[PDB]
Amino acid sequence: MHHRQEGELSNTRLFVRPFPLDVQESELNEIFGPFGPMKEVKILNGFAFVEFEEAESAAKAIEEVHGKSFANQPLEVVYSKLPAKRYRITMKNLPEGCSWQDLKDLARENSLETTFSSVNTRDFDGTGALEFPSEEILVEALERLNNIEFRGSVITVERDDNPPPIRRS
RNA sequence: AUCCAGUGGAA
């Protein structure tokens, strides 16, 4: 959730609400399936967001699904928040004194700011990754957040040419 | 009734 909204989406994401409970990507692929190639469906507790390759396939499905049922409940699909790409980079550090909370405070106390922070490692290696709202923060982070000496450790933030947004929940 | 897109403030 965020206070900044626009409601001027690319006409592709479709927000659903009146789910049963065990929907879990088992009937969206059937209802939204014949409507278009459907890039992805992100169902989660209390709602879902289907997405299409064309503004036409999305509008068509909403026009036909916002007035029927898949769970003995009246559906009322509407347009979702604005689909958007974001940036990410690979970072290295030390297996101590770190959590995604500290990399958020670290990044924001220099000049830049992270939209998300991670420390994906099984044995906790200190290494992780950082997210950015655009490339103009990535190309700066590798010069400002690079090797600044954090807690006596060292941040090796560098661009690995991040993949597209993570698929599904 | 109704908004997440790595379902996060130590998690």
From Swiss-Prot:
Residues annotated with Phosphoserine modification: S69, S99, S111
Q: Where is the RRM domain?
A: 12-82, 87-162
The superkingdom listed in its UniProt entry is: Eukaryota
State its location(s): Cytoplasm; Nucleus; Cytoplasm, Stress granule
Where does the signal sequence lie?
none
Changes after translation: Methylated by HMT1. The methylation is required for nuclear export.
Q: How does it assemble?
A: Interacts with RRP6.
**Other observations noted:** Present with 78700 molecules/cell in log phase SD medium.
Q: Give the similarity note.
A: Belongs to the RRM GAR family.
Please give the function described in this protein's UniProt entry. Answer: Involved in mRNA processing and export. Required for efficient splicing of a large set of pre-mRNAs by efficient co-transcriptional recruitment of the splicing machinery. Remains associated with the mRNP during early steps of translation elongation.
Descriptive protein name: Serine/arginine (SR)-type shuttling mRNA binding protein NPL3
- The species this protein belongs to is Saccharomyces cerevisiae (strain ATCC 204508 / S288c)
Give the stretch of the parent protein shown, with its full length.
Answer: 114 to 282 of 414
